[PDB]
Amino acid sequence: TEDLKYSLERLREILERLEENPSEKQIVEAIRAIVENNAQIVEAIRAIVENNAQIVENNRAIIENNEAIGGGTKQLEEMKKQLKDLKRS
Amino acid sequence: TEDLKYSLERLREILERLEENPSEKQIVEAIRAIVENNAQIVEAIRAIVENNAQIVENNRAIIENNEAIGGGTKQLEEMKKQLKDLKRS
Amino acid sequence: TEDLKYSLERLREILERLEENPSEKQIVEAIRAIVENNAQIVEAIRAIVENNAQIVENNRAIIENNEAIGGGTKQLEEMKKQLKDLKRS
Ligand SMILES: [Br-]
Ligand SMILES: [Br-]
């Protein structure tokens, strides 16, 4: 992500020269720079997307823990029902 | 992400010709391609931001399961006290 | 991500003038606009990446709750074993 910020910084420096003394080779130089920055942006998006797979894994885990807690909650309610009935005995 | 990867590869080819034999219409053609690629980048960021709403949902669900586990742990300790107290009688 | 969508829309509007009557100052105008759009894209990616730290925090919390649910299940099983022993004897 720091690569991105630097890439953009180089791009602003090229644009700085271009706007002062315009030139065709500087226009092309600018476009090449833009492409390189775009290629890094795509790499970063690619990494964000692969990383975001964890959101799904966290989802499944939360859902599993929901179920486990439900089972334990029922077992404790059956245990409390066992004591209340046994204590009377 | 493949769509994004492809519009970048096209953009490399346009840039390829541009540097081989520079021209105005090629410069414009390149700028048009950059706009198209940026539009795809923006859609991808939009989808990433949309998709990332699930992180908020996960955190809330985690917080709720924390409360349930807190209640279940409290009752098990309340039950343990009951059993130990019963053993006396 | 509305700033992005507007920036891209401005960029498409400069691109219409460019393809209408090509010109050097318009080519530069377009490149400056592209740089600004990329700058916003980078900011957006930056924010997505910082936000995504919460995925790590959620993962840890889920792991913590897995351990607690495991201990609660063990304690409840040992309690069920105790009552069955007391009820018998
Ligand atoms: Br998450
Ligand atoms: Br959880």
Ligand lying closest to the C-alpha of residue A53: 1
Nearest-neighbour CA in chain C from B46: distance (Å) = 7
Residue range of the domain that includes B40: 2-88
Which member of B5, B22, B69 has the closest CB to residue A24? B22
Integer Cα distance of B40 and A45 in angstroms: 11
Resolution (A): 2.3
- What technique was this entry resolved by? X-ray
* Residue in this structure with the two tokens 């692969």, named with its chain if needed: A50
Are the beta carbons of A62 and B58 closer than 8 angstroms?
A: yes
Integer Cα distance of B9 and A38 in angstroms: 11
* Size of chain A, expressed as the number of residues it contains: 89
Q: Is B23 on the interface with C (CB under 8 A)?
A: no
Token digits of residue C52 = 């995504």
Integer Cα distance of C89 and C78 in angstroms: 16
Nearest-neighbour CA in chain B from C2: distance (Å) = 9
The SS3 call for residue C22 is: coil
Q: How many domains does chain A have?
A: 1
CB atoms within 10 A of CB B71: 13
* Size of chain B, expressed as the number of residues it contains: 89
Q: Name which of B28, A15, B68 is nearest C39 in CA terms.
A: A15
C77 CA distance to ligand 2 middle (Å): 21
Q: Is C34 on the interface with B (CB under 8 A)?
A: yes
